[PDB]
């Protein structure tokens, strides 16, 4: 699969509820939700090696990983974690996260290239899922 692109959002669902599970208080959630409405996602892929940059007005992240090799990043609410991405299937990667310290909801994220040329991202916290869809600019 070729995840590479400058991806523009066309749909966002359930981010506020994700943040509620993660315990983000009401006024911070309001800020986060507004900014996360227009995120820019840049992906560069070379085989099973990836770079992903996510940009919003209130948070920008960059990660580098190889599928099947543990790495460190943060949860969406900003807690450090150890992560491991696996191919769930040919066009879909799944990242399991384990907190470095403390206890919290079980979190993960996924990226899938859909047959229409678009990209589905999910983020999960326990049972609750946020779904975003993108198309290249
Ligand atoms: C949660 C949260 C915040 C905002 C986070 C945002 C805006 C995340 C966007 C993530 C995306 C957009 C990820 C992706 O799609 O890969 C701020 C900074 C207010 C601090 C309080 C907790």
Swiss-Prot record:
A motif (Nuclear localization signal) lies at residues 20-30. It comes from the Eukaryota. It holds the Pfam family Lipocalin. Sumoylated in response to retinoic acid binding, sumoylation is critical for dissociation from ER and subsequent nuclear translocation. There is a cross-link at residue 101 (Glycyl lysine isopeptide (Lys-Gly) (interchain with G-Cter in SUMO)). It is found in: Cytoplasm; Endoplasmic reticulum; Nucleus. One of its GO terms (biological process) is epidermis development. All-trans-retinoate binds at residues 132-134. PROSITE patterns: FABP (PS00214). CDD domains: CRABP2 (cd19461). GO terms for molecular function: cyclin binding; fatty acid binding; retinal binding; retinoic acid binding; retinoid binding; retinol binding. Keywords: Cytoplasm, Endoplasmic reticulum, Isopeptide bond, Nucleus, Retinol-binding, Transport, Ubl conjugation, Vitamin A. Induction: By retinoic acid. InterPro entries: Calycin, Fatty_acid-bd, ILBP, Lipocln_cytosolic_FA-bd_dom. Transports retinoic acid to the nucleus. Regulates the access of retinoic acid to the nuclear retinoic acid receptors. Interacts with RXR and RARA. Interacts with importin alpha. Belongs to the calycin superfamily. Fatty-acid binding protein (FABP) family. This is Cellular retinoic acid-binding protein 2. It comes from Homo sapiens (Human).
């Amino acid at each position: 699969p070729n995840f590479s692109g400058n991806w523009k959002i066309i749909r966002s669902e359930n981010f506020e509820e994700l943040l509620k599970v993660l315990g983000v208080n009401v006024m911070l959630r309001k800020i986060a939700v507004a900014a996360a409405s227009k995120p820019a996602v840049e992906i560069k892929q070379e085989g099973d090696t990836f770079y992903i940059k996510v940009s919003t007005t209130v948070r920008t992240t960059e990660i580098n990983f190889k599928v099947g090799e543990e790495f460190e990043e943060q949860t969406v609410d900003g807690r450090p974690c150890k992560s491991l991405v696996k191919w769930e299937s040919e066009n879909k990667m799944v990242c399991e996260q384990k907190l470095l310290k403390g206890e919290g909801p079980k979190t993960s994220w996924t990226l899938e290239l859909t047959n229409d040329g678009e990209l589905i991202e999910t983020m999960t916290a326990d049972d609750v899922v946020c779904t975003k869809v993108f198309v290249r600019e």
